[PDB]
Structures are given as structure tokens and as C-alpha cells.
Amino acid sequence: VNSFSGYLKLTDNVYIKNADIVEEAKKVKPTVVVNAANVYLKHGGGVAGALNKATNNAMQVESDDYIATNGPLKVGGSCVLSGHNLAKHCLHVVGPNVNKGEDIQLLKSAYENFNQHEVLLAPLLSAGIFGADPIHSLRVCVDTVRTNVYLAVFDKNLYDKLVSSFL
Ligand SMILES: O=C(Nc1ccccc1)Nc1ccc(C(=O)N[C@@H]2c3cccc(O)c3C[C@@H]2C(=O)O)cc1
């Protein structure tokens, strides 16, 4: 039993809710919140900018030290950093950014990072300003992630479409 409320169950392990991931993180304080990161961990917009803002820029400060030590992530890769005031941990996952021409097949590799964590609060990878089709992203999520994932979808119109079109 966990503390996530109001989710629709899509499969054995995938749940979805129309919610602001920042507000959901602030209320649940999950073990892991997933960030829609880029390889530089520059949290300027989209989910990343919102999560970083909610940490009063502490996420960005920690991220800049991580990059200075380790260099950029790979597209499809991830790193575990602090969750600050939002979660125990933040899993920064780099989905491909279609608006940069990155290979959409890397989306499956990106979702594979979720399997290293038993339970996660997460956005749809590569959705929003990353330019992928969120319906495709949801399909890859369901077909790749085997651990328990609670997806927060900010846009109500998109949430309903995602639900209504889900196979
Ligand atoms: O800024 C906050 N919250 C907040 C921050 C500071 C203080 C208080 C509250 N939230 C927030 C901001 C942006 C996003 C976001 O870009 N969504 C994306 C979106 C939008 C439309 C269609 C989409 O396919 C997607 C993908 C992504 C998502 O829905 O996952 C999501 C959440």
C-alpha cells in the first residue's frame, strides 16, 4: 500500500493522474521523483524548470556541481541526485528531444532507467517541450517499465486523450 491518491490504473504496474508533478511531489514526498532532464542538467523549462523552481534553485546548484565533476549525461541515460523538498531522490532521466533531432528509439532506453527503482512519480518522458507524441511515450512506458510508476500529466485535455486512446 502506498500514499498515491486518485490514480487511474492502466496496467498491473502503471498508473496515471491529471496532476501537477510539483504539487504531487510536495504532497506525497515520494522516494523517487523523475525529472525530464537534458544532458547538461540545465533545468530551464518544462517539467525540469518547474521542479527546479520549486526547490528554490537548489536542484540547479547541485546539478551544476554534478556536471562539473562528471560531465554530461547520455541521451537515454540518468543520474540519481537529491530530491530536495520534493522527494527523497530525484532521478534525472534524459529522453530524446525531437526538437533537437534525437533518435526516438532512445525513448525505450530512457524508460529502462525507471526499472532500477521500485516506485516512482514521473512525467511522460520526451513529452511536452521535448516534442515527442505523448501517446507514443505512454505506450513505450507501459511496454518498458516493470516497476510501479505513477504518471502525472499536467494538461487535463491531454490526460483525457491519453486515457481515451489507451490500448
Ligand atoms: O511549474 C509547475 N508547478 C509549480 C512550479 C513552481 C511552483 C509551484 C508550482 N508545474 C509544471 C510546469 C510545466 C510542466 C510541463 O511542462 N508539462 C509538460 C506538458 C504540457 C503540455 C503537454 C505535454 O505533453 C506536456 C509534457 C509535460 C508534462 O505534463 O509532464 C509541468 C508542470
Coordinates of N, CA, C and O in Angstrom, one line a residue, residues 33-97:
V33 N 11.2 11.0 -7.4 CA 10.5 11.8 -8.4 C 11.4 11.9 -9.6 O 12.7 12.1 -9.5
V34 N 10.9 11.6 -10.8 CA 11.6 11.7 -12.1 C 11.6 13.1 -12.6 O 10.5 13.7 -12.8
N35 N 12.8 13.6 -13.0 CA 12.9 14.8 -13.8 C 13.1 14.5 -15.3 O 13.8 13.6 -15.6
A36 N 12.4 15.3 -16.1 CA 12.6 15.3 -17.6 C 13.8 16.2 -17.9 O 13.7 17.4 -18.3
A37 N 15.0 15.6 -17.7 CA 16.3 16.3 -17.8 C 16.8 16.4 -19.2 O 16.4 15.6 -20.1
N38 N 17.8 17.3 -19.4 CA 18.6 17.3 -20.6 C 20.1 16.9 -20.1 O 20.3 16.8 -18.9
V39 N 20.9 16.6 -21.1 CA 22.2 16.0 -20.8 C 23.1 17.0 -19.9 O 24.0 16.5 -19.3
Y40 N 22.8 18.3 -20.0 CA 23.6 19.3 -19.2 C 23.0 19.5 -17.9 O 23.5 20.4 -17.1
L41 N 21.9 18.9 -17.5 CA 21.1 19.2 -16.3 C 20.8 20.7 -16.2 O 20.9 21.3 -15.1
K42 N 20.5 21.3 -17.3 CA 20.1 22.7 -17.3 C 18.6 22.8 -17.2 O 17.9 22.5 -18.2
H43 N 18.1 23.1 -16.0 CA 16.6 23.0 -15.7 C 15.9 24.3 -16.0 O 15.5 25.0 -15.1
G44 N 15.7 24.6 -17.2 CA 15.2 25.9 -17.6 C 13.7 26.0 -17.8 O 13.1 27.0 -17.6
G45 N 13.1 24.9 -18.4 CA 11.7 24.9 -18.7 C 11.0 23.6 -18.6 O 11.7 22.6 -18.2
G46 N 9.8 23.5 -18.9 CA 9.0 22.3 -18.9 C 9.0 21.8 -17.4 O 9.1 22.5 -16.5
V47 N 9.0 20.4 -17.3 CA 9.0 19.8 -16.0 C 10.2 20.2 -15.2 O 10.1 20.5 -14.0
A48 N 11.4 20.2 -15.9 CA 12.6 20.5 -15.1 C 12.6 21.9 -14.5 O 13.0 22.1 -13.4
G49 N 12.3 22.8 -15.3 CA 12.2 24.2 -14.8 C 11.2 24.3 -13.7 O 11.5 25.1 -12.7
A50 N 10.1 23.6 -13.7 CA 9.1 23.7 -12.6 C 9.7 23.0 -11.4 O 9.5 23.6 -10.3
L51 N 10.2 21.8 -11.5 CA 10.8 21.1 -10.3 C 11.9 22.0 -9.7 O 11.9 22.2 -8.5
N52 N 12.8 22.5 -10.6 CA 13.9 23.3 -10.1 C 13.4 24.6 -9.3 O 13.9 24.9 -8.2
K53 N 12.4 25.2 -9.9 CA 11.8 26.4 -9.3 C 11.3 26.1 -7.9 O 11.5 26.8 -6.9
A54 N 10.6 24.9 -7.8 CA 10.0 24.5 -6.5 C 11.1 24.2 -5.5 O 10.8 24.3 -4.3
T55 N 12.3 23.9 -5.9 CA 13.5 23.8 -4.9 C 14.2 25.1 -4.7 O 15.3 25.0 -4.1
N56 N 13.7 26.2 -5.2 CA 14.4 27.5 -4.9 C 15.8 27.5 -5.6 O 16.7 28.1 -5.1
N57 N 15.9 26.8 -6.7 CA 17.2 26.7 -7.5 C 18.2 25.7 -6.8 O 19.3 25.6 -7.4
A58 N 17.9 25.1 -5.7 CA 18.9 24.1 -5.1 C 19.1 23.0 -6.1 O 20.3 22.4 -6.1
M59 N 18.1 22.5 -6.8 CA 18.3 21.4 -7.8 C 19.4 21.8 -8.8 O 20.3 21.1 -9.1
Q60 N 19.3 23.1 -9.3 CA 20.3 23.5 -10.3 C 21.7 23.6 -9.7 O 22.7 23.3 -10.4
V61 N 21.8 24.1 -8.5 CA 23.1 24.2 -7.8 C 23.8 22.9 -7.7 O 24.9 22.7 -8.1
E62 N 23.0 21.9 -7.2 CA 23.5 20.5 -7.1 C 23.9 20.0 -8.4 O 24.9 19.3 -8.6
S63 N 23.0 20.2 -9.4 CA 23.3 19.7 -10.8 C 24.5 20.3 -11.4 O 25.3 19.6 -12.1
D64 N 24.8 21.6 -11.2 CA 26.0 22.2 -11.8 C 27.2 21.5 -11.2 O 28.2 21.3 -11.9
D65 N 27.2 21.2 -9.9 CA 28.4 20.5 -9.3 C 28.5 19.1 -9.9 O 29.6 18.7 -10.2
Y66 N 27.4 18.4 -10.1 CA 27.4 17.1 -10.7 C 28.1 17.1 -12.1 O 28.9 16.3 -12.4
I67 N 27.7 18.1 -12.9 CA 28.2 18.2 -14.3 C 29.7 18.6 -14.2 O 30.5 18.1 -15.0
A68 N 30.1 19.5 -13.4 CA 31.5 19.9 -13.3 C 32.4 18.7 -12.9 O 33.5 18.7 -13.3
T69 N 31.8 17.8 -12.1 CA 32.6 16.6 -11.7 C 32.6 15.5 -12.8 O 33.6 14.8 -13.1
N70 N 31.4 15.2 -13.4 CA 31.2 14.0 -14.2 C 31.0 14.2 -15.7 O 31.0 13.3 -16.4
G71 N 30.8 15.5 -16.1 CA 30.4 15.7 -17.5 C 29.0 15.4 -17.8 O 28.2 14.9 -16.9
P72 N 28.5 15.6 -19.0 CA 27.1 15.5 -19.4 C 26.7 14.0 -19.3 O 27.4 13.1 -19.4
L73 N 25.4 13.9 -19.1 CA 24.7 12.6 -19.3 C 24.7 12.2 -20.8 O 25.0 13.0 -21.6
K74 N 24.3 11.0 -21.0 CA 23.9 10.4 -22.3 C 22.4 10.6 -22.6 O 21.6 10.5 -21.6
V75 N 22.0 10.9 -23.8 CA 20.6 10.8 -24.2 C 20.2 9.3 -23.9 O 20.9 8.4 -24.4
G76 N 19.1 9.1 -23.2 CA 18.7 7.8 -22.8 C 19.2 7.4 -21.4 O 18.8 6.4 -20.8
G77 N 20.2 8.2 -20.8 CA 20.7 8.0 -19.5 C 20.1 8.7 -18.4 O 19.1 9.4 -18.5
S78 N 20.7 8.6 -17.2 CA 20.1 9.1 -16.0 C 21.2 9.3 -14.9 O 22.3 8.7 -15.0
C79 N 20.8 10.0 -13.9 CA 21.6 10.0 -12.6 C 20.6 10.3 -11.5 O 19.6 10.9 -11.6
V80 N 21.0 9.8 -10.3 CA 20.3 10.0 -9.1 C 20.9 11.1 -8.3 O 22.1 11.1 -7.9
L81 N 20.1 12.1 -8.0 CA 20.6 13.2 -7.1 C 19.5 13.4 -6.0 O 18.6 12.7 -5.9
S82 N 19.7 14.5 -5.2 CA 18.8 14.7 -4.1 C 17.4 15.1 -4.7 O 17.3 15.8 -5.7
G83 N 16.3 14.7 -3.9 CA 15.0 15.2 -4.2 C 14.7 16.5 -3.5 O 13.6 17.0 -3.6
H84 N 15.6 17.1 -2.7 CA 15.4 18.4 -2.0 C 14.1 18.3 -1.2 O 13.9 17.4 -0.5
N85 N 13.3 19.3 -1.3 CA 12.0 19.4 -0.6 C 10.9 18.6 -1.3 O 9.7 18.7 -0.8
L86 N 11.1 18.0 -2.4 CA 10.1 17.3 -3.2 C 10.0 15.8 -3.0 O 8.9 15.2 -3.2
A87 N 11.1 15.1 -2.7 CA 11.2 13.7 -2.7 C 12.5 13.3 -2.0 O 13.3 14.2 -1.7
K88 N 12.7 12.0 -1.6 CA 14.0 11.6 -1.1 C 15.1 11.8 -2.2 O 16.1 12.4 -2.0
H89 N 14.8 11.3 -3.4 CA 15.7 11.3 -4.5 C 15.0 11.9 -5.7 O 13.8 11.7 -5.9
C90 N 15.8 12.5 -6.6 CA 15.4 12.8 -8.0 C 16.2 12.0 -9.0 O 17.4 12.1 -9.0
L91 N 15.4 11.2 -9.8 CA 16.1 10.5 -10.9 C 15.9 11.4 -12.1 O 14.9 11.6 -12.7
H92 N 17.1 12.0 -12.5 CA 17.1 12.8 -13.7 C 17.3 11.9 -14.9 O 18.3 11.3 -15.0
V93 N 16.3 11.9 -15.8 CA 16.3 11.0 -17.0 C 16.2 11.8 -18.2 O 15.4 12.7 -18.3
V94 N 17.1 11.5 -19.2 CA 17.2 12.2 -20.4 C 16.5 11.4 -21.5 O 17.0 10.5 -22.0
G95 N 15.2 11.8 -21.8 CA 14.6 11.3 -23.0 C 15.1 12.1 -24.2 O 15.6 13.2 -24.1
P96 N 15.0 11.5 -25.4 CA 15.3 12.2 -26.7 C 14.5 13.5 -26.9 O 13.2 13.4 -26.6
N97 N 15.1 14.5 -27.3 CA 14.4 15.8 -27.6 C 14.2 15.9 -29.1 O 15.2 16.1 -29.9

